[PDB]
Amino acid sequence: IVGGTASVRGEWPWQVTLHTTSPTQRHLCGGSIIGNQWILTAAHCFYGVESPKILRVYSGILNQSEIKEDTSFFGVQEIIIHDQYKMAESGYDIALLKLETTVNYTDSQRPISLPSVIYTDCWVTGWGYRKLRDKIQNTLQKAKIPLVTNEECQKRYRGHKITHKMICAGYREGGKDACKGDSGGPLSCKHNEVWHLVGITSWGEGCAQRERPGVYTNVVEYVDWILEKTQ
Ligand SMILES: NC[C@H]1CC[C@H](C(=O)N[C@@H](Cc2ccccc2)C(=O)Nc2ccc(-c3nnn[nH]3)cc2)CC1
């Protein structure tokens, strides 16, 4: 996250860190708890993941440095990528992880509601870079970002097809954005004091550049897909 601040424990309890363990253990992508057995993330995260056997889902993490050899994690039973997905920039950038067992919800691990509205209180969160050439951050970062219209977003990405299945967010002057390692995490919007998972962090041109908003999977356009897959 560029131009963000440190989160505190329990601030974003639906935020997970998805680790790969091949050839070494490291953060791969963010994700969001949407059900006791269900993580919503980006399809692109799984490019060259050989199978779910190498994945570990960590919930209730603030600092990456908390994760040791005895730290509990969830195994991944199944990766469900949208059948029309080919590439992040071409949309359908959405995936479910079915966990091997149920998350018992606590102060530190809680589900986020799907959307059913003008969202004015939207936040992007993750352990990603603070600038284009950087490293994964120890402490989960947060930044408040304004949504932009799909009409404005298309004008900034004339090499790409921006559809109603995408939502864009960013400042005209730049300064705050998702960056490398934030993908798959949530764009969380608070509406009537309830948090909604409005976006999944997907792609963009660089990080926090002027007139280059972040592009997110528009979760409300996939609610029927999610409900079909989650039963
Ligand atoms: N301004 C809009 C932003 C929107 C999110 C974008 C993003 O995050 N894309 C992923 C793609 C990706 C995900 C997973 C695997 C390969 C590639 C990505 O780049 N991840 C990534 C990179 C680097 C490390 C890494 N680990 N250690 N050092 N670097 C770890 C994950 C950046 C643009």
Numbering used by the authors: 388 to 503, 509 to 623
Source paper text:
Activated coagulation factor XI (FXIa) is a highly attractive antithrombotic target as it contributes to the development and progression of thrombosis but is thought to play only a minor role in hemostasis so that its inhibition may allow for decoupling of antithrombotic efficacy and bleeding time prolongation. Recently, another serine protease in the coagulation cascade, factor XIa (FXIa),7 has emerged as an attractive target, because it may allow for a more selective reduction of fibrin generation: FXI is activated via FXIIa after contact activation or by thrombin in the course of the positive feedback loop for thrombin amplification, but it is not involved in the tissue factor pathway, which is key for fibrin production to cover a vessel wall leakage. Thus, this form of “selective coagulation modulation”8 by FXIa inhibition may allow for a decoupling of antithrombotic efficacy and bleeding risk and offer the opportunity for better antithrombotic protection to a much broader patient population. In this study, we describe our drug discovery efforts, resulting in the identification of asundexian (BAY 2433334, 80), a direct, potent, selective, and reversible small molecule FXIa inhibitor for oral application, which is currently being investigated in clinical Phase 3 trials.
To explore FXIa inhibitors, we synthesized tetrazole 1 (inspired by chemical matter published by Bristol Myers Squibb in 200723) which showed good potency (FXIa IC50 = 9 nM). A docking experiment of this compound in the published X-ray structure of FXIa24 indicated that the 4-aminomethyl-trans-cyclohexyl residue would occupy the S1 pocket. An X-ray cocrystal structure of tetrazole 1 in complex with human FXIa then revealed the binding mode with the key hydrogen bonds and hydrophobic contacts. The 4-aminomethyl-trans-cyclohexyl moiety was indeed found to be located in the S1 pocket where its primary amine forms a direct ionic interaction with the carboxylate of Asp189 and a hydrogen bond with the backbone carbonyl of Gly218. The S1 pocket is the only deep pocket of the FXIa active site, and ligand 1 extends from the S1 pocket into the S1′ and S2′ pockets. We hypothesized that this orientation in the binding mode toward the prime sites might facilitate the required selectivity versus other serine proteases such as FXa and thrombin, as potent inhibitors of the latter use the more druggable pockets of their nonprime site (S1 and S2; S4).25 The cyclohexyl-bound amide carbonyl oxygen forms two hydrogen bonds with the protein backbone forming the oxyanion hole (OAH in Figure 1). The ester binding pocket (EBP) is not occupied with substituents of 1. Located in the S2′ pocket, the tetrazole moiety of 1 forms a hydrogen bond with the hydroxyl group of Tyr143 and a water-mediated interaction with the carbonyl group of His38. In the S1′ pocket, the phenyl ring of the benzyl side chain participates in a hydrophobic contact with the Cys42-Cys58 disulfide bridge.
